[PDB]
Write a protein that binds this ligand. Structure first.
Ligand SMILES: Nc1ncnc2c1ncn2[C@@H]1O[C@H](COP(=O)(O)OP(=O)(O)OP(=O)(O)O)[C@@H](O)[C@H]1O
Ligand SMILES: Nc1ncnc2c1ncn2[C@@H]1O[C@H](COP(=O)(O)OP(=O)(O)O)[C@@H](O)[C@H]1O
Ligand SMILES: [Mg+2]
Ligand SMILES: [Mg+2]
Lengths: 370, 345, 146, 370
């Protein structure tokens, strides 16, 4: 029968089948629509383009994200994405095919019921389960107790986990994610002259940050390094063939995670967020939790980030305390990997909402059996 | 056969019929009743362990990508090809409980989670087996890191004892300090604590940018071998800063205490354990002897150093010297650049 | 009329389950009435009940005429309008003592000005109590918890 | 020695003396050169017609703006304009008078150094300072806290200011400005039959807009009204005696400021741009910004724009919020007025950039004190 695992993210949608190692179909989570007039009539035209189809034709479309900061805002747009993933990317009928879903921590109560009715009625899925992004993230790292720095595209999270259950009183949240990081790069990119003021031109500036931006161990040292010599300069070629050069702006884009005053936020950095979220737990657990810092999400894939925060946390933590930053190489798709492991367990079949079970209790049944 | 289910917030059957409730009027023929099209509505919308322990065991067994039978042989044989320091800690927590063993003994049909436990139960003294290689591998990663720290602090003390510029430098400030504080409570003192050099920059001049350290460096610039060879001798103590000797000493003793305790348990086991793990434990025991022996040399070396600075015992707690000396050297380098910048501009 | 029809229809759809056969539902149910979809996937339960309601125009189609005032009332919270009236009144009374203790040259021009504004707000807060009494009946009208 | 103020704009150069109520010399920032053949001889001929001279003889000249989108590019043309202002329009000696200059925010860092370098070397001024356009705009109103919508000629920027200091993390910028509205006028003027292509005819279309253009309150009704009756049509006389008639083209030109999709841009209008800049600020200071919208710049003088912005902002802000837009009659010269006020104050002294300090850091000292 096989069970599908579908991860719905702010930036990318990762789906596939349980038991494998990598997602079968990962594509950006956008639904674009034309903003021009269709002069030709012979070609086939469509009202909306979903997924990487919209990304390819992004020059004549405006790109809208159905998910903002983890929560599902456009519920009619997210029904198109699920249909696209099930029928176009994977090309598998959702009928007679139980699926699994991953939900953000502190998910609103109303959203959980809404998804249950969508899959059980429209797609006629015989069985379905709902999990948590942070819980599945620690499973994929071969652990059961630790603190997860789930920093995706929408929202950064610090979810301490103890024996497979999260600690709701110690769960933090910071609105310093990838989407906010690329919007800060556009503002400082005009200091050299280059201007990007379009949503389609945001994807172009996304790839500049992904390839060229890194993290400096000492901000002052890198600040003086760029001024002393132009060795830090790098060249990137735009899609239209122009060439752009960025110097000290390379390491100032991901530094906002540690000095959030750059973007205007008055909160503390990601290094302090873990320290603050660790004092809400028991004293005895703190020794165990301090050596199990597990990375997750794509926004943490920066050069010298697993070392910069270790230097920072050392200052906040006591000298006796030990720190062990865990940064698996495949941390970009960690959330899906844990879900694939969980769905393949032989004993996991007891935690599935059967179709006959749904015929007794409606979408409110998702809170039970979970 | 089946109808689409719409979810509503059901009101209690005893509250929705109250007088204030509007639904009370609908329950009686007091309003214009309307009937929907019923004909069209139907044709248009038509294991023994707890979950905490059992699930955590399967997750622990899913990082090996092997059968449950194979992983039992590795534990029985003591192989450490796929077992690391952190992996062993999770296994130590995930051990059979008092109720788990009773249920298994009272007893394929049983799930794969308990299947590994049955294979693990057949392994003799499984509790001792996991602890044997946990300490040996952990001890290997401990000695090779404490030893450079022990040599670094010992070397720093010897260089500090044999330093030539500090007796010259500490005399110049003392001679200057007596002149500055003549006729007051301060001054005319035979000596001062090592923390005095950390407050040298607090004495500002008329320019407000040249400190007392800057001025004594300006006159020391004339004699380059004098007072400027000092930072070359302060490199080793500077690196020793931030490395306390109390944690490294406790770690060596704590591991030895646990290793010695398990040595008796291993000796009480069968001869198979002795011929291929007992010699490993005693090898680590003898290796740590040189580590603690060097610590006594450091303690003897710092005892002379504690009396070298003429400071009270328990007040010069090793790390205080390392932190203060590194900061003093750091301030010394910054003043040199400012003095050189002042000379050129 | 509308809430009775959905209750009659909803019981039919949920017959034989935990939901159904209920004497009533919360006011938020109508916000989820359009989520149920039919075979066409573009005609919802709201669309179907409107199709049979289109036969009887005075029934179920005169409702939006009555909903214009509640619709305009949305977005105006009463927690800032009540606080603002009280906050300004408190400052006026505190300064009323200060001006009274001042020279009569200020009182002849400013004291009577403050009293005019103070008396004006009395009718404002009195209407607030009328709203509180009115909404108390509405809260029990929908049979929802306070 | 009295100080000098020179507000180098994109379309007009306004310069004068510190303390004066009005600028002494305002002339367009255009440099024209002949394109035909100088058949006549024995007569005084020039090849560097700049400012007012080039405007009169625009029939035989090609008019070029040295400043585009607020960024100076033709640096040899800007030297001519500065030399024209210092020696011809004002008749002053640069080496004896301190100077103050105004520069838009979110400008390339390279622009600041070049502007300082020219004045301290080519003209050898004793003291010089550079101030933000929107900061000086609020000083004209006498305030020190507010949000300024400065729609000049080349760029439209919004700068919320609090207690005399700007908020760099909440500044929004829109490239649509007055000049881009002039070019859109010629595009729709071809609908009725009038063709304007020459840069000499570019100024004619500018003057048509400055007289016959107004902002409609309700675009749907005003478009229906214009097609219903000819009561909205006016007439304009070209320099050759020809008369033209425009109907609904009167308000369709400044409507682009509120529907930028007309000229193909994607960003929202000024009403939504201003609203977005408020939410980037702290919630405790939005009370002081929602009631201090102080417009400036020439482009903000379309009749009905003040009423239109109040109506549009009202539909976005909460109903209980108080919205008050200040539209001073002298907003054309607001940026200069604030500069004249500031230079006269004795507090602005001891803040000059003197010659003995410029050589310490070269042209990079302008960033030290700005
Ligand atoms: N090499 C990289 N360097 C920096 N950032 C990166 C890199 N690779 C990916 N990212 C960031 O990862 C973001 C999306 O990654 P990710 O898969 O974690 O998001 P997501 O699944 O949408 O998140 P969420 O679960 O929070 O909704 C991109 O927007 C990008 O900024
Ligand atoms: N009455 C008016 N109606 C519409 N636009 C105007 C009016 N007066 C001036 N403008 C516009 O203002 C622009 C230049 O004004 P100004 O703000 O002084 O430019 P800058 O600030 O760039 O020096 C011109 O391009 C013109 O289109
Ligand atoms: Mg995610
Ligand atoms: Mg201007």
């Amino acid at each position: 029968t096989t069970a599908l695992v579908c991860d719905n993210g702010s930036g990318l949608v990762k789906a596939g089948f349980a038991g494998d190692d990598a997602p079968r179909a990962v594509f950006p989570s956008i639904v674009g629509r034309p903003r021009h007039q269709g002069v030709m009539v012979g070609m086939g035209q469509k009202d909306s383009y979903v997924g990487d189809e919209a990304q390819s034709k992004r020059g004549i479309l405006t790109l809208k994200y159905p998910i903002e900061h983890g929560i599902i805002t456009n519920w009619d747009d997210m029904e198109k994405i699920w249909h696209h993933t099930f029928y176009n990317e994977l090309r598998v009928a959702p009928e007679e095919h139980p699926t699994l879903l991953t939900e953000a921590p502190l998910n609103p109560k109303a959203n959980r019921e809404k998804m249950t009715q969508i899959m059980f009625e429209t797609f006629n899925v015989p069985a379905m389960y709902v999990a948590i992004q942070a819980v599945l993230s620690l499973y994929a790292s071969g652990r059961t107790t630790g603190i997860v720095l789930d920093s995706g595209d929408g929202v950064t999270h610090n979810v301490p986990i103890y024996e497979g259950y999260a600690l709701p009183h110690a769960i933090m949240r910071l609105d310093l994610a990838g989407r906010d990081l690329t919007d800060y790069l556009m503002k400082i990119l005009t200091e050299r002259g280059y201007s990007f003021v379009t949503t389609a031109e945001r994807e172009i500036v996304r790839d500049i940050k992904e390839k060229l931006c890194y993290v400096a161990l000492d901000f002052e040292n890198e600040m003086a390094t760029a001024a002393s010599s132009s060795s830090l300069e790098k060249s990137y070629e735009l899609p239209d063939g122009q060439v752009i050069t960025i110097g000290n702006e390379r390491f100032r884009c991901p530094e906002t995670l540690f000095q959030p005053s750059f973007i205007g936020m008055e909160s503390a950095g990601i290094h302090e967020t873990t320290y603050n979220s660790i004092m809400k737990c028991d004293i005895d657990i703190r020794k165990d939790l301090y050596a199990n810092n597990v990375m997750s999400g794509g926004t943490t894939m920066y050069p010298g980030i697993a070392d910069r925060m270790q230097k920072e946390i050392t200052a906040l933590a006591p000298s006796t305390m030990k720190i062990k930053i865990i940064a698996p190489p495949e941390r970009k798709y960690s959330v899906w990997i844990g879900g694939s492991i969980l769905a393949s367990l032989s004993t996991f079949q007891q935690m599935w909402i059967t179709k006959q079970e749904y015929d007794e209790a409606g979408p409110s049944i998702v809170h039970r059996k979970c | 056969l089946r109808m689409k289910k719409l979810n509503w917030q059901k009101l209690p059957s005893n509250v929705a019929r109250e007088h204030n409730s509007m639904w009370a009027s609908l329950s009686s023929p007091d309003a214009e009743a309307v009937e929907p099209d019923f004909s069209s509505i139907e044709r248009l919308f038509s294991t023994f362990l707890d979950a905490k322990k059992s699930l955590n065991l399967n997750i622990f067994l899913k990082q090996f990508k092997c059968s449950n039978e194979e992983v039992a042989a590795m534990i029985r044989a003591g192989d450490t090809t796929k077992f690391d320091v952190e992996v062993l800690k999770q296994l130590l927590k995930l051990l059979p409980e008092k109720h788990e063993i009773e249920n298994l003994r009272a007893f394929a049909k049983l799930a794969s989670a308990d299947h590994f436990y049955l294979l693990l139960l057949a392994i003799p003294c499984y509790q001792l087996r996991i602890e044997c290689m946990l300490l040996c591998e952990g001890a290997a990663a401990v000695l090779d890191m404490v030893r450079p720290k022990a040599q670094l602090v010992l070397a720093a003390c010897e260089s500090l004892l044999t330093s030539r510029q500090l007796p010259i430098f500490c005399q110049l400030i003392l001679r200057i300090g007596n002149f500055l504080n003549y006729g007051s409570h301060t001054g005319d003192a035979d000596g001062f604590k090592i923390s005095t050099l950390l407050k040298l920059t607090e004495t500002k001049s008329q320019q407000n940018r040249v400190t007392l350290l800057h001025h004594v460096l300006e006159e020391a610039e004339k004699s380059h071998p004098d007072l400027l060879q000092l930072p070359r001798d302060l490199e080793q103590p500077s690196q020793a800063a931030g490395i306390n000797l109390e944690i490294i000493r406790s770690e060596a003793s704590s591991n030895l205490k646990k290793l010695l305790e398990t040595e008796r348990k291993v000796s009480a086991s069968v001869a198979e354990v002795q011929e291929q793990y007992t010699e490993r434990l005693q090898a680590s025991i003898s290796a740590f002897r040189a580590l603690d022996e060097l610590f006594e040399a450091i303690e003897q070396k710092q005892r002379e150093l504690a009396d070298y600075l003429c400071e009270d015992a328990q007040q010069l707690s090793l790390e205080d010297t390392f932190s203060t000396m590194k900061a003093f050297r750091d301030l010394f380098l910054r003043a040199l650049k400012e003095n050189k910048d002042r000379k050129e501009q």
